[PDB]
Design an enzyme around this catalytic site. Structure first.
Site, PDB file in Angstrom:
ATOM      1  N   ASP A 196      37.627  27.643  51.785  1.00 48.30           N
ATOM      2  CA  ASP A 196      38.382  27.352  53.360  1.00 48.30           C
ATOM      3  C   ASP A 196      38.494  25.849  53.429  1.00 48.30           C
ATOM      4  OD1 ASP A 196      38.780  27.826  56.038  1.00 48.30           O
ATOM      5  OD2 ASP A 196      36.604  27.484  56.417  1.00 48.30           O
ATOM      6  N   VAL A 243      25.909  23.326  63.559  1.00 47.45           N
ATOM      7  CA  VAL A 243      26.400  21.598  64.087  1.00 47.45           C
ATOM      8  C   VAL A 243      26.144  20.720  63.057  1.00 47.45           C
ATOM      9  CG1 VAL A 243      25.838  20.200  65.976  1.00 47.45           C
ATOM     10  CG2 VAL A 243      26.454  22.566  66.482  1.00 47.45           C
TER      11      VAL A 243
END
Ligand SMILES: NS(=O)(=O)c1cccc2c(O)cccc12
EC number: 2.7.11.22
Length: 278
Positions: free
Chosen positions: A118, A17
């Protein structure tokens, strides 16, 4: 975590997170990523990889056997800016400025042999000054969406190259232009076959060695390639030419970031200011 006050959540990263937070000592507001020896040493290399188009890794806090990454904070990402610009679309001069800056960022990382692996709109962060920056660079080596994955990765190549980032950025370039994802796959085979339907099923003519890849199957359906004019209208011929080279099947033929920067598409490049509401 003692010197950081959490303000709000700003992202469910691939690796945990992400919070907006304030450094109680510097007054600085940062993006704080909570990660969840080699990873330690890898991260440490990234702290040195500084460039105006790379989100700055401010600090790395390994404490209580925990890992927190402190990044430069930016207020907006390209996915949200695209969603917000969907009625009109991003003006082409801004698209071109963003693509140019990202290619600079890539050329930098690539010359240091660091890959992103990514790239996606959610990790391209923008500011009021017209800058765009690559976030989460090199994290994938240190430790969901398939849409931007290069075909050699999909076909099971384990030793892929910097070419994978050029493929992802081509897919993003296309999406900015058309305001639709180029290859929105929802599984690895759906992703592959979406690529094939558009660019043609690859073979030994266009990609020598393709048929010997780990997940290549002679049973793949054989689709014909579409013309780019149908793929990214109303992009001009320079843009389509560049995009075609960023989307070459063979990773050895695919354009490098440094060569992309010399492409004629960028002859009239400028640096516009976006209209961001924060
Ligand atoms: N890429 S992300 O979604 O974790 C993210 C979102 C907002 C700001 C970020 C930042 O300032 C630095 C890294 C990632 C961020």
């Amino acid at each position: 975590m003692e010197n950081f006050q959490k303000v709000e959540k700003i992202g469910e990263g691939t690796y945990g997170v992400v919070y907006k937070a304030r450094n109680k000592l510097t007054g600085e507001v940062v993006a704080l990523k909570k990660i969840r020896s080699t990873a330690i040493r890898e991260i440490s290399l990234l702290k040195e990889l500084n460039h105006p188009n790379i989100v700055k890794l401010l600090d790395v806090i390994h404490t209580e056997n925990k890992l927190y990454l402190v990044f430069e904070f930016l207020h907006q990402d390209l996915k949200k800016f695209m969603d917000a610009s969907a009625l009109t679309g991003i003006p082409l001069p801004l698209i071109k400025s963003y693509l140019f800056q990202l290619l600079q960022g890539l050329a930098f990382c690539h010359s240091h042999r660091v890959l992103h692996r990514d790239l996606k709109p959610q990790n391209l962060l923008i500011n009021t000054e017209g800058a765009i920056k690559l976030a989460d660079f090199g994290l994938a080596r240190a430790f969901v969406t398939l849409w931007y994955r290069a075909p050699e990765i999909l076909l099971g190549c384990k030793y892929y190259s910097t070419a994978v980032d050029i493929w992802s950025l081509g897919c993003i370039f296309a999406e900015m232009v058309t305001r639709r994802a180029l290859f929105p796959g929802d599984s690895e085979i759906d992703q592959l076959f979406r690529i094939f339907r558009t660019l043609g099923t690859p073979d030994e003519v266009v990609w020598p060695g393709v048929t010997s890849m780990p997940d290549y199957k002679p049973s793949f359906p054989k689709w014909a390639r579409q013309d780019f004019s149908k793929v990214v209208p109303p992009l001009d011929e320079d843009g389509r030419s560049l995009l075609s080279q960023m989307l070459h099947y063979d990773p050895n033929k695919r354009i490098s970031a440094k060569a992309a920067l010399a492409h004629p598409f960028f002859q009239d490049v400028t640096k516009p200011v976006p209209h961001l509401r924060l």
